[PDB]
Symmetry: D2
Subunit: 326 residues, 4 copies
């Protein structure tokens, strides 16, 4: 029936979309959300997660943990919409009651560890984590819970393989922002899938066609929600066109959750992935032996039908969210 | 009056000596001991700490935390050989740490258990809270990644590094640094107040001579001749290797020097500098590279703030003062064992 | 007006094609060829250059220098080097190397890696503005030259087949062979004040494919005049074809190095952008990566990069190439 | 009898002393001197070598080659180069460089970094066993040579002032100047199959000090014959003395490079051990570190999966320091006699 999972992310407009998908998807049973540094500081990402939840009427249900603020050994490096309402009507974070805290100042990076460890122990086979930001939190967890590595399955939006990078020439943001984390994870015995590398996500575009379907599914039920999801969806659009050459912008992170929902739409290959850490201009490069034992599965492309299947999934969820907001 | 401090270490024969010094010293008020990987796995070091405590009649008083098992981004027989621990093992009291934590038994101990306890101490600290580190510094790097803001309120006093002499386990680096150099690199750039209190520079001049041995016997055989055998077996355990591998007629005693700094810093020379820890280097990771020589050459072009104090040498009297301190404590321990 | 230039290369089937283009092109006035390690050892590449020349009736005219055998600070990575074809005749009818007379040598055993240095330096001193070098192998020879002639850097212009920029690499995930095989060389060159163009990165050369259409035009232009030459150029052209299909996914294989010479002949068919290129040397899995700030450009440059041909460029390239092959076929007869 | 050798160096006050030793030593038959970047630019070092020669009445005999100006893949860290002394006379009475006639050049502007290559290659081919090179600056020239003459590597023996092993470095915390200034060169050399001795690491040279005792012996041997030469050699010898005291802690300064030539003259005064030496190149703060497996071999010699590639001289045998200084002062005496 449905899969227990946790979300680690840095919302982020795509992470907001992925949260929406995972939560409202009946197929995924989200246990918690951990936030990490990346786009913004972990403090802002934490709030951005809670905003996503509160917008979709779930902030009283799902605990959000505020995670680690910087990479293991390196320095660090939700607009379009007014959050003032979502902010002041924000319910208390279930995480605080779990932890014994009175308020959010007491939240610490390692709060999610005990909760994850219950889930992992409970897991029949392996417990599922969707990661769509830096993977510092999981590296940290594994340094504290080495033995849990073999019982964790990870499904990530991260990497570029057969195409070049985004924020640096040959690497993708989530990897390069803390490459030791992913290197650590990959050699930890974790079961790791690169479910949504640039290879795929750059073929998953918010066209005006996709926009009309969103309007189709949501304006009927909640035309306020329509404005919001579209403003968000088009927010880094000009940069994507001008900086990167995208007439229409990609939507990265929900693809990762879609893998866990419906992996039949993805191609898969096992290989050995090396993460560049020593490299001066190339740290975060995902270098495979495709084109040493295998250590990851890589999804290089969707099967035919996959794009439509993804968008039907995504628009369904948006429709259901629009209905609840009303 | 006396200094509240915590001990992070990997016993280890010297760490055992340092624990003895810090605990029995009236000047230091040991709040807890955190153990780390190094010599042995963190699991063995943890037990080795508890053995040290139980030998000296303190295992019921001081909580011991079992810390992180491997370096941040790198790979890692009892750990306390020469001696039979079977008695100290079976008469071991419950770990105060478990009651603090809400655990029933030691299987529940996790690497990050000490974090909350350290954070109370640091918040409580008037100025800064003191940590003596004599193993890898993974635990503190980990702590600081979770408590960045606490960095400015922690003072660290370490047995680590070589500066004006070469290394031990590798040509130009010392064990505790090279075993996790990112940890120390992290710590040093975190805004922690850091002293290299006991680098090889000093500890290699702190030697367990037959003279020192006779004084130990002098102070302990009268009160507990069993304890005498034990402390001497331990003290001479890596002695042949130190002679043959390294050229030491008499072996050094490293880690208690670090605790001695916190007890009595007047016996040490000190210089501030900028220390860079080699991490990129293939044969040289863990090298403590200072700008001490740049500052003589041309102090006016130094574009890097100091970040550590380095103790390059003891003042005259320091060695005697160290050994009087150490032998006093051993004497007092011998009296309690009886 | 035709351009005095020198060729540094590691033939290599493409380098053989580039040599053919440059020599027989009236627009380029080839002064010498220096060979380097890469595909094969520099000794085999040296002979492969002489074979190219002797096949096209030029081995008595142009001096060939045998250059450096390994990278500056790295080990080499890597048949004859020019397989698919029988060289026994071209080998035994090989005329004496003009280089030996230039150098005062009796035979080829006397050739040394640094023999081209004095000859290049005359050309560079003579140059009105800058002297042109086409490089389509490792760039060890030029790095070496520049370490001996630092001051000549500002008077040398380089036009290279090297790099990948907006697409991934070939022999390694994100780097191209010629760069990664000695990345310190290119790093050295780029910070030397040399005027450098990446004229033919994978970005372009992967869109320059030996189709069966191109093959028929070759046959068209050559079989009439010399059907032996036809067999040879086609065997060579299809020699790493299966690997290109199976290893790399190419129905039809790319032809890299002649694109570099084509830049020097007719740069109007190429787009160009100036940027700062950093060559990865520290990187463990990524050495030889050409990392530019092209995308950072929203707000010093050291190279020009040609990311793509203008429309017409591919046709223009192939007309150029087939012309030359035709002219070669006529001379062999 | 006597050993054919070549000198590669960056004078430099010590290199000047080493040149004096090698040339005037009957035991060494100096074929040429190649200069390299280091202390100064290779152009100044080149002239500093010619000045050394002309001072000692040899500039008309020995060819001096001007070599490579920068490291293989790094920037230089590059005064006359030979300060404390007025060279205006030695400069204007300088005879033509024998190198120019060898090369077919009219003047010195024609000198190029790779001029010594052909001359070295004749010597190496001629060599019965191996040909000897004393290197006391950066080793860029030899790395360059070997990149052009790979096959000659097995017939070259190198005796160097370079490195620190069981003590720390000088110009950087754990490395010595000559290595760190171009570490890829030495790395290249060591893996080329060259027979390499670290004859004079800091380990030794830091125990070879120009005391006031040594100074008086110099005066003893030279003032009788040429009191002008006395002033010069002493000014030179004390020129970086204050820095050595203040920057580095030396009451009396070390004299590095002649120790290397002394090895080739009289190796019986040195201890020797074979090991595998790795040169740090990747390291950010530690490039140029000479990292040996000497300690691995005491710990567990049976696990060593790397062949030895160098001899290291960690120390002089007893008598070695006296023997060195008698050698050095003899030569200075003989030089003083010729200058008159
Ligand atoms: Ca994200
Ligand atoms: Ca220890
Ligand atoms: Ca080529
Ligand atoms: Ca020198």
């Amino acid at each position: 029936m449905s899969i227990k999972c946790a979300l680690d992310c840095d919302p982020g407009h795509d992470d907001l979309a992925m949260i929406m998908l995972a939560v409202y998807s009946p197929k995924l049973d989200v246990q918690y959300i951990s936030t990490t540094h990346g786009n913004q500081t972990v403090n802002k990402t934490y709030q951005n997660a809670r905003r996503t939840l509160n917008l979709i009427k779930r902030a009283d249900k799902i605990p959000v943990y505020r995670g680690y603020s910087k990479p293991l050994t390196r320095e660090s490096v939700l607009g379009g919409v007014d959050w003032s309402e979502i902010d002041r009507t924000m319910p208390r974070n279930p995480a605080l009651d779990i932890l014994g805290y009175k308020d959010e100042s007491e939240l610490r990076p390692d709060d999610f560890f005990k909760h994850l460890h219950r889930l992992v122990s409970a897991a029949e086979d392996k417990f599922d984590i969707i990661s769509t930001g830096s993977e510092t939190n999981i590296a940290q967890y594994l340094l504290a819970y080495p033995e849990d590595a073999k019982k964790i399955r990870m499904t990530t939006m991260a990497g570029n393989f057969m195409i070049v990078g985004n924020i640096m020439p040959f690497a993708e943001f989530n990897v390069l922002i803390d490459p030791e984390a992913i290197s650590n994870i990959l050699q930890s015995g974790v079961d790791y899938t690169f479910a949504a590398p640039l290879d795929i996500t750059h073929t998953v575009l918010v066209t005006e066609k996709v926009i009309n379907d969103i309007k189709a599914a949501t304006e009927p039920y909640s035309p306020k929600f329509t404005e919001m999801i579209i403003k968000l969806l088009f927010f880094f659009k000009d940069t994507y066109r001008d900086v990167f050459g995208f007439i229409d912008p990609p939507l990265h992170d929900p693809v990762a959750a879609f893998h866990l929902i419906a992996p039949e739409w993805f191609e898969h290959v096992r290989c050995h992935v090396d993460i560049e850490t020593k490299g001066e201009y190339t740290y975060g490069c995902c270098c495979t032996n495709l084109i040493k034992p295998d250590n990851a599965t890589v999804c290089l492309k969707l099967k035919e039908g996959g794009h439509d299947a993804f968008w039907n999934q995504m628009i369904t969820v948006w429709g259901e969210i629009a209905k609840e907001i009303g």
